[PDB]
Curated annotation (Swiss-Prot):
It is found in: Cytoplasm; Late endosome; Synapse, Synaptosome; Cell membrane. Residues 22-106 form the PDZ domain. It is linked to Nephrotic syndrome 15: A form of nephrotic syndrome, a renal disease clinically characterized by severe proteinuria, resulting in complications such as hypoalbuminemia, hyperlipidemia and edema. Kidney biopsies show non-specific histologic changes such as focal segmental glomerulosclerosis and diffuse mesangial proliferation. NPHS15 is an autosomal recessive form with onset in the first months of life. Disease severity is variable. Some patients show rapid progression to end-stage renal failure. Belongs to the MAGUK family. Specifically expressed in brain. Interacts (via its WW domains) with DRPLA. Interacts (via its second PDZ domain) with PTEN (via unphosphorylated C-terminus); this interaction diminishes the degradation rate of PTEN. Interacts (via guanylate kinase domain) with DLGAP1. Interacts (via the PDZ domains) with GRIN2A, GRID2 and NLGN1. Interacts with CTNND2, CTNNB1, MAGUIN-1, ACVR2A, SMAD2 and SMAD3. Part of a complex consisting of MAGI2/ARIP1, ACVR2A, ACVR1B and SMAD3. May interact with HTR2A. Interacts with IGSF9, RAPGEF2 and HTR4. Identified in a complex with ACTN4, CASK, IQGAP1, NPHS1, SPTAN1 and SPTBN1. The lineage of its organism: Eukaryota, Metazoa, Chordata, Craniata, Vertebrata. Seems to act as a scaffold molecule at synaptic junctions by assembling neurotransmitter receptors and cell adhesion proteins. Plays a role in nerve growth factor (NGF)-induced recruitment of RAPGEF2 to late endosomes and neurite outgrowth. May play a role in regulating activin-mediated signaling in neuronal cells. Enhances the ability of PTEN to suppress AKT1 activation. Plays a role in receptor-mediated clathrin-dependent endocytosis which is required for ciliogenesis. The gene is MAGI2. It comes from the Eukaryota. This is Membrane-associated guanylate kinase, WW and PDZ domain-containing protein 2. It comes from Homo sapiens.
């Protein structure tokens, strides 16, 4: 039924709970057909913030939203800064490809800033 919780971060990715899967996207013009979020902090799990509709990530079927970034190309990044990980994505020029390993079973982040609000509309 219900069950407990505790722990102290991941490390070897092995302590995540989910499936593990991968894709190779070739960087076609512009940039990959998804965008990322990371916690700001230098040990928060990075996630796909969105998939671009009609983008190559969507056309490979495999990229989904909320998915947790474990590794990029062949680098362990699951606690790296979104500063470094965004630099890692930018380090790939157009027409090259990278591997990505995500973990599956994680939801999207709840956004503590604004997850969905509005002001005094009547209704």
């Amino acid at each position: 039924g219900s069950s407990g919780s505790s722990g102290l971060f991941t490390r070897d990715a092995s302590q995540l709970k989910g499936t593990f899967l991968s894709t190779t996207l070739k960087k076609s013009n512009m940039g990959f057909g998804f965008t990322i979020i990371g916690g700001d902090e230098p040990d928060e799990f990075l996630q796909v913030k969105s998939v671009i509709p009609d983008g190559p990530a969507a056309q490979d079927g495999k990229m989904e939203t909320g998915d947790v970034i474990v590794y990029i190309n062949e680098v362990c990044v699951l606690g790296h800064t979104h500063a470094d990980v965004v630099k890692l994505f930018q380090s790939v020029p157009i027409g090259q490809s990278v591997n990505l390993v995500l973990c599956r079973g994680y939801p999207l982040p709840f956004d503590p800033e604004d997850p969905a609000n509005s002001g005094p509309s009547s209704g």
